[PDB]
Amino acid sequence: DSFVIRGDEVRQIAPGQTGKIADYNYKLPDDFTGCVIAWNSNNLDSKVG
C-alpha cells in the first residue's frame, strides 16, 4: 500500500493508533505481520507555491 502523507502523521501509521489519517484515511489492523517504510520526498513532491 503506497501513498503520500504529512511528515508528522507517519507516527499514526501503526497498529492501534488514533488520529485523522489513521481513523479516517488509512487504518492499520492490530496484528499487521508486516513492515512500514517511510522516507522524505520534499525534493520530489513539493513545488513552489
Partner: protein
C-alpha cells in the same frame, strides 16, 4: 507507543479500592519481562517510582500499591486508600526509545456532596480609580469539582472575559474552593447596573444566583 489511561480523576472513599487502567498501542512486553512502569507525583514534589516492571514494587513503596497486567493492558490497584495517597499517577513505557508517559490520573478522596457557599464582591473604589474593575464570584466548601460559573451583566451572557481558579482539596474539610474573576474597563463597567453570578452545581436543586447593582 501511545498510552491511553483510565479516567483522569478518581473519587474513592478512604480504605476503598482504587483502580487505574492503562492500555498501550503496541505490546510493551519484550525479553519475557514487561516494561510497563507506574509513577506517582505529589504536587510540589518530583515524580516517584512506584512500580518498575509490570508488578515489581519500587524501593520504599508500601504494600498498598499493586501492579498487574501484561501485553497491552495494565492496572494499578490501591485497596487501603490513604489520605497521603493524594497525588497524580502516571503510566509509562520503557520498551522503545521514546519513553511515553500516560495522560495522568489524579486521585482524590470522596466525601458527601456539599452545597457551595456562594459570594460576590464588587470591585474596590481604589481599583475603579485605576481604570480597571474586577468583580469576583466565590464558591466556598463545595464538592465535587463539577461547577459552572456564569456571568450575567444586565442579564447578558458574558464569555471570554472571566478567569476561574480552583484550589486543591482541603487537608481537613476536603472540599474544593473556586474564584471566578470578571475584568472590565472602568468606562465599560460603569455602563451597566445589574451584575449576577450564576452557580450550577450537582448539590443544588437549581442554580444559585447572587446579584448586586453597581454603587
Amino acid at each position: 507507543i501511545v498510552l491511553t489511561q483510565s479516567p483522569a480523576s478518581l473519587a474513592v472513599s478512604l480504605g476503598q479500592r482504587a483502580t487505574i487502567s492503562c492500555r498501550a498501542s503496541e505490546s510493551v512486553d519484550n525479553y519475557g519481562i514487561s516494561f510497563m512502569n507506574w509513577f506517582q507525583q505529589t504536587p510540589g514534589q518530583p515524580p516517584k517510582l512506584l512500580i518498575y516492571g509490570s508488578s515489581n514494587q519500587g524501593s520504599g513503596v508500601p504494600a498498598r500499591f499493586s501492579g498487574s497486567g501484561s501485553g497491552t493492558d495494565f492496572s494499578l490497584n490501591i485497596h487501603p486508600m490513604e489520605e497521603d495517597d493524594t497525588a497524580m499517577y502516571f503510566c509509562q513505557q520503557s520498551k522503545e526509545v521514546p519513553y511515553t508517559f500516560g495522560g495522568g490520573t489524579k486521585l482524590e478522596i470522596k466525601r458527601t456532596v456539599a452545597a457551595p457557599s456562594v459570594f460576590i464582591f464588587p470591585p474596590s473604589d481604589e481599583q475603579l480609580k485605576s481604570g480597571t474593575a474586577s468583580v469576583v464570584c466565590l464558591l466556598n466548601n463545595f464538592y465535587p469539582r463539577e461547577a459552572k460559573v456564569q456571568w450575567k451583566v444586565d442579564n447578558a451572557l458574558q464569555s471570554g472575559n472571566s478567569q476561574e481558579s480552583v484550589t486543591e482539596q482541603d487537608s481537613k474539610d476536603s472540599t474544593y474552593s473556586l474564584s471566578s474573576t470578571l475584568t472590565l474597563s472602568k468606562a465599560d463597567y460603569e455602563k451597566h447596573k445589574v451584575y449576577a453570578c450564576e452557580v450550577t452545581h450537582q448539590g443544588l436543586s437549581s442554580p444559585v444566583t447572587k446579584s448586586f447593582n453597581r454603587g
